[PDB]
Symmetry: C3
Subunit: 491 residues, 3 copies
């Protein structure tokens, strides 16, 4: 009672969280934050990216001009969304390397089309069918021109169209494969048929194939679709002795941030930077477990469902420096205004006060980690396909392998980051506790002794103002030294 | 002699191991463990994966039905093993995109075949050759049906087969290329020949090519092999005016964990999760240097031949805290029952005792690292090919680049992991030593002084029970304080 | 004045550098080094790699034998450099899968050509044109043999050439597509034309296409180029009924470290291991921001423009241990012969001296980090293409995705490495300061007291030799103990 006690300590909470570190799979800290985004709100937000809902139409069908897709003429998009309900309702067609055409168009992000005046002297234009009805009338693909004989003759065509512009031109055309020799004659007079379209730097030579195929909406014939790009100063050359499905012009082709995504999520009236096929997701977290397919500023896809980053010290209710969960037996749940602090006992009673500077020092370092990790995602736009509806073999094997490789490496980075950061967070918080203890010890000089549990026995009368002077660094040890020494070194 | 000495210390071994850290390329620790698996037992274990030894047959030959491979009918596998000795002994064939067909079949993991009753009215079935002898008789591919003229005529075929099942069907067929017009007439009556097989969603149009090729086992003609997949509700349509090598049904196609591997390792009667072409390897280590080609739960392939993870403190015979290899001059090889401990000298003699708690604290942390690294490998099944027998160019360049990229990134992860873990292991062991020293110092209060080399000079008579009381935390400093103070502060 | 003062401290500089750590985006250290190479000297050094400047010729043109490229016959290279100014000046040609042929040749690294004596009995050899003028004379591709009719007939050819060597043979050949039926007859007599070349393991069947294409240097006809590889014991078989552009032999095909690069950088007379299209770059740094396209021992491409690795302690003008920027208020700019040291005040004056051992300990650890990072780059040769002149779709998407994936992962590794190393460097330097302080404290025993700011109050007369004895570890505390104790414990 001619003495006082000053104890150094740290806070603790009743509701701790378990995190992983380098040396321990399960250790409890006072607080943590989730680094893996695991949920979507179920909608694709129409902002801030220009969304184009394909609805009943695939991109290709909108490109070709299926009457159902007339409203899509000359549209632009950041992201084209293909629905699973979609279907074609015009003339049956196939595209060799469909995926590549779909990709380059999607990446271009526009359906801007210019009509071109080709000299088709000698044939009947605007061919038409009952499988492709527009406004209740028999029609055809809006961007394609079906040619037939004129007066039972089909001369050889030798048509050119030069690109005298500053931009590339994208031409879409096709070859008809009638189901019967009868039809071949009826349409084109000739028995054979042959198409050759060229530029200075390419030749595409197609020979049509008469034959029956299983009927799609009761049609056994097919059209095969092809494309060719013509650059400034180059020229398109179309030769045909029949069966040519002609273009009515070219598509502009651009480069930018545009792409395409398969999803059934409804479009919402909302704003979100990151889009997945499950719907838009927040991008505050550095990682996500929602979908490997993303568009925009998105967290990186990892395999883990959860990864907790410690944002507080080790929770000890009741480190390398050995203070927290070391020589300090437990934390103080009763300390709610700081992370580290002082408890005392003197002649005037018992008290508790937080230390702000040490509290702030730990908090600043932890916020430093958060700033490196939170709200710093990276933009990706058109990528590769990551889900497949048909077996393809070699190329699909490679595409799958590349993505699986990427995911495991990022999943590794995420796991290690958290383990390392959490080990370091537990150690830096232990460190700040030790620094405060060490500083206090030096302040007291020869006037106190370390009891070994974070507490100092102060060998002199130390009232509330004295204790306060210790806590704010104005304690003058020389004032009490004589009193303390006599108390310390007696019998 | 009115005094005692208590020294704090750590163990050391005569046989240390050199490891790498962040700051030092070569530092000696008491013990380490190897993280890179560098050897195989030379056999492929037949457990726990269903192994199928191709022996003399490639997967394709077993698929087609080379008589040599009759025993493989309807087999399933987790892993198909292709031998280098393998060879074909039927009709000479090629497969365009051989690699893709090989892959999809291998990935499917089954040769389950259902026979289908096609209406081949108008032709001769079960064509046969002297190049493909079965049971000493001239025969053909068991799954293929070679059609020829009936009564010197070959009408146009228009055969359909609908998929009215719940699963996909895999059809294998082929086109014959006779070496002579003479043979073309003899077999098919017609001079030309043409094959067209279709579904609702595809057309494969082949035009046979009469001509001579270098003779394979004395045959100058060839067959080209093709495949088509037919889904539920779709239909196969086969049109031919000759040369058609017909299917006798379909293969079931599955999806799962199946794959194929090229190896000459014998199959052993043993159990091992990880398979390489060199043979099975243990998967206790996180990394391996045996082969980039793996199947099953395998360690990851890295370029390093060795990577030592420290599992013990720095070995000092004769860290950031400066105790081990610091103010403590060297370790004690004579301490074999603990990592840290006490040596004393008093009136009753000289002694040594291990400290269990500090020893266990270091060991637990090191075992924590091991648990994160040991026995946690990840399963991979069908991947991409990683060795190539022919020059192919672009696609092979990409396949090689992808794998080389993956390997360097994992090799980087492995090198950094070990360097970081070892720096941390050396530091945590130094830390535990410092904690024990610090705790002991506080226990002694004013009764001892730090001699600066890990030893305390105790300023009072301290017999074996006294020393023991210090080592187990029951030392009451107040009992000796008067004696110690008088000895300390004298002239 | 019956007392002395000894202060422990560290250096500081007027010109600090800002680096990144784990907990702080901007912290100042005494010195740092740049890890990202950001510049080129603008030239491609001709050493130590064998450089081949294509000049006006592409690799393919040098392969085929455009007269402009005659000087390139049988050349070898480590790296072939294609200029953008390059152009073809012979017969107009295309190569299907041009990129793959370009790649395999570049990777082979040689134009070594052996002439072979084919039996072309029945046709006219050495066909020639006005589009391909050699020495002012009409000529053709030096490695190709243009065949025409002899006496208005073109019989069927059935020529073989066996590989009875120990190495592979690379055959280059072509198919002519005349612009008119008139030309077809004039050259080959026959109206059709057909080419079939085979080995035991392959068939390439081409059917020429008569037709007009936009004129290249006033030629509307084209040649299509093809290749086939023939292995030891295999045989080439060439069948043609016209239009065959024949080979005059084979190219040797090798495997090794050869590749090709597109660049307009001039070749310099200098020595540098790493080549980019911007020019050669030094490879002392582990990372570079110059170009994703590299050849040789090169730093890895990252997205960051700068990454500073700390090579010195925290700069404090005027850590986890709390010494530097902690209880030691600031550094000493006046200390230029060491990183850590002593300042004293006694009866003889005031002094400063560096401590070498602690200085060297920090420096050695930092040099350890540098040795792991500096001058350890890895060799890469032929890779994949990373810039593209035409839209291609699927395969190009994959090639771009693979490279973008690789770059982000390395950029991540680089950012984390630096943040981790810098946090550790700041901590280890703080640690060495603390060790020196701790060691000094123990030396002084009961003869001094810690003033809490790195300074000791020494309670006895301590002249220059005494202070010196403290700095070099020969201070005998027992000599001054009586004097110090009486001064310490008085009233
Ligand atoms: C080849 O066979 C198919 C299948 O029998 C024929 O296609 C059918 O034609 C009938 C009428 O001719 C239609 O009612 C069916 O819907 C068709 N089925 C399919 C799957 O398309 C086809 O006409 C035959 N080819 C020839 C030339 O006769
Ligand atoms: C084209 O030439 C090849 C090579 O001479 C011929 O193939 C050979 O035919 C003879 C008998 O006719 C066999 O003994 C050889 O083994 C064959 N060699 C090869 C490599 O196949 C081929 O017959 C010729 N073609 C024609 C139509 O005569
Ligand atoms: C097909 O049309 C093209 C374009 O008019 C013709 O090519 C031109 O031919 C004239 C002389 O005949 C040349 O002066 C031009 O330079 C050619 N232009 C191009 C782009 O090649 C071609 O001759 C026509 N084909 C036929 C068979 O008449
Ligand atoms: C702990 O409880 C408080 C009070 O409800 C709450 O604010 C805090 O988020 C909780 N922490 C965790 C990790 O649940
Ligand atoms: C837990 O940590 C996060 C991140 O710093 C913070 O937003 C949250 O307020 C913390 N919770 C408490 C109860 O302090
Ligand atoms: C889409 O097609 C369905 C037919 O299945 C039709 O009911 C619906 O009205 C169509 N929607 C649009 C926007 O055309
Ligand atoms: C063909 O139809 C289009 C509109 O559908 C029209 O612009 C064009 O003039 C028509 N051509 C002929 C020859 O009728
Ligand atoms: C293909 O099959 C049907 C029925 O014979 C028809 O399209 C045609 O006759 C066949 N092909 C040829 C080339 O005859
Ligand atoms: C997102 O969709 C995929 C299927 O495309 C599904 O496996 C996954 O569970 C979904 N995620 C969420 C959070 O709904
Ligand atoms: C320190 O505490 C004492 C005691 O309460 C008080 O009088 C003094 O103003 C404080 N000093 C500072 C700088 O806060
Ligand atoms: C050191 O020697 C002991 C005794 O033979 C042995 O058990 C231990 O494995 C050895 N350590 C190394 C790294 O060889
Ligand atoms: C060396 O470390 C490994 C891993 O902890 C352990 O299995 C082995 O027993 C250790 N060796 C000795 C001699 O302690
Ligand atoms: C494999 O083929 C060889 C011929 O080289 C033969 O000796 C052996 O018996 C064959 N093995 C089997 C299992 O058919
Ligand atoms: C053809 O042979 C198979 C068995 O090899 C037999 O099942 C089938 O009935 C035969 N067909 C004819 C027409 O002989
Ligand atoms: C191909 O070469 C041989 C020998 O002439 C034969 O198969 C055939 O006659 C040739 N091809 C043609 C189309 O004549
Ligand atoms: C495994 O096989 C590869 C060749 O496929 C060889 O390079 C490697 O050295 C082998 N490894 C072992 C451990 O035998
Ligand atoms: C501590 O050591 C003393 C001296 O040997 C012994 O008497 C006592 O039982 C020990 N206490 C414990 C808790 O082990
Ligand atoms: C600081 O200044 C000195 C003297 O000019 C110089 O040697 C050193 O490189 C400078 N450091 C930096 C980071 O500029
Ligand atoms: C800065 O650090 C680098 C790397 O250690 C060194 O080359 C350079 O000399 C240092 N600068 C000074 C002024 O020490
Ligand atoms: C390259 O071609 C240009 C023509 O544009 C010519 O002036 C130059 O001399 C050529 N250089 C060589 C080395 O042939
Ligand atoms: C064709 O020309 C080459 C050289 O250009 C010559 O070696 C060869 O003998 C010539 N052949 C004939 C048939 O003139
Ligand atoms: C292709 O166009 C031109 C002009 O008619 C010519 O090459 C040829 O006649 C055409 N093709 C065919 C097969 O007639
Ligand atoms: C190198 O060239 C690329 C274009 O190929 C350019 O973007 C980059 O800025 C160049 N780098 C330097 C350092 O000149
Ligand atoms: C230590 O310093 C003293 C005082 O200057 C000097 O006499 C002595 O030689 C030094 N000892 C060593 C080993 O340097």
């Amino acid at each position: 009672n001619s003495t006082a006690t000053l104890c150094l300590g740290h806070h603790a909470v009743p509701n701790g969280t378990i995190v992983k570190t380098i040396t321990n799979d399960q250790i409890e800290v006072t607080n943590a934050t989730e680094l893996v985004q695991n949920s979507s709100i179920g909608e694709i937000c129409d902002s801030p990216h220009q969304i184009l809902d394909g609805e009943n139409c695939t991109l290709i069908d909108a490109l070709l001009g299926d009457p159902q897709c007339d409203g899509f003429q000359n549209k632009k998009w950041d992201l084209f969304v293909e629905r699973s309900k979609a279907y074609s309702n015009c003339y049956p067609y196939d595209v060799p390397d469909y995926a590549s055409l779909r990709s380059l168009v999607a990446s271009s992000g526009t359906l801007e089309f210019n009509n071109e005046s080709f000299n088709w002297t000698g044939v009947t234009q605007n061919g038409t069918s009952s499988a492709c009805i527009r406004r209740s009338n028999n029609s055809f693909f809006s961007r394609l021109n079906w040619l037939t004989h004129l007066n039972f003759k089909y001369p050889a065509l030798n048509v050119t169209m030069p690109n005298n512009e500053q931009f590339d031109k994208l031409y879409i055309w096709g070859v008809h494969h009638p189901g019967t020799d009868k039809d071949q004659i009826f349409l084109y007079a000739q028995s054979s048929g042959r198409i050759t379209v060229s530029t200075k730097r390419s030749q595409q030579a197609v020979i049509p194939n008469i034959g029956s195929r299983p009927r799609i909406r009761n049609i056994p014939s097919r059209i095969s679709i092809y494309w060719t790009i013509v650059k400034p100063g180059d020229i398109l050359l179309i030769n045909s002795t029949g069966n040519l499905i002609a273009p009515r012009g070219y598509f502009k082709i651009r480069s930018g941030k545009s792409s395409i995504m398969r999803s059934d999520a409804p479009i919402g009236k909302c704003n979100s930077e990151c889009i997945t096929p499950n719907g838009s997701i927040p991008n505050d977290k550095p990682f996500q477990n929602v979908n490997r397919i993303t568009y925009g500023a998105c967290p990186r896809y990892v395999k883990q469902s959860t990864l907790k980053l410690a944002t507080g010290m080790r929770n000890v209710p009741e480190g390398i420096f050995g203070a927290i969960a070391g020589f300090i037996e437990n934390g103080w749940e009763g300390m709610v205004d700081g992370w580290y602090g002082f408890r005392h006992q003197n002649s005037e009673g018992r008290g508790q006060a937080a230390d702000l500077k040490s509290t702030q020092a730990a908090i600043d370092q932890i916020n430093g980690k958060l700033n490196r990790l939170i709200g710093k995602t990276n933009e990706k736009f058109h990528q590769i396909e990551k889900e497949f509806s048909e077996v393809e073999g070699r190329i699909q094997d490679l595409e799958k392998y590349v993505e699986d490789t990427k995911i495991d490496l990022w999943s590794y980075n995420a796991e290690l980051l958290v383990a390392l950061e959490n080990q370091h967070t537990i150690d830096l918080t232990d460190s700040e506790m030790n620094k405060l203890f060490e500083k206090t010890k030096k302040q007291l000089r020869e006037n106190a002794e370390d009891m070994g549990n974070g507490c100092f026995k102060i060998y002199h009368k130390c009232d509330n103002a004295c204790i306060g002077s210790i806590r704010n660094g104005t304690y003058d040890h020389d004032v009490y030294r004589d009193e303390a020494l006599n108390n310390r070194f007696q019998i």
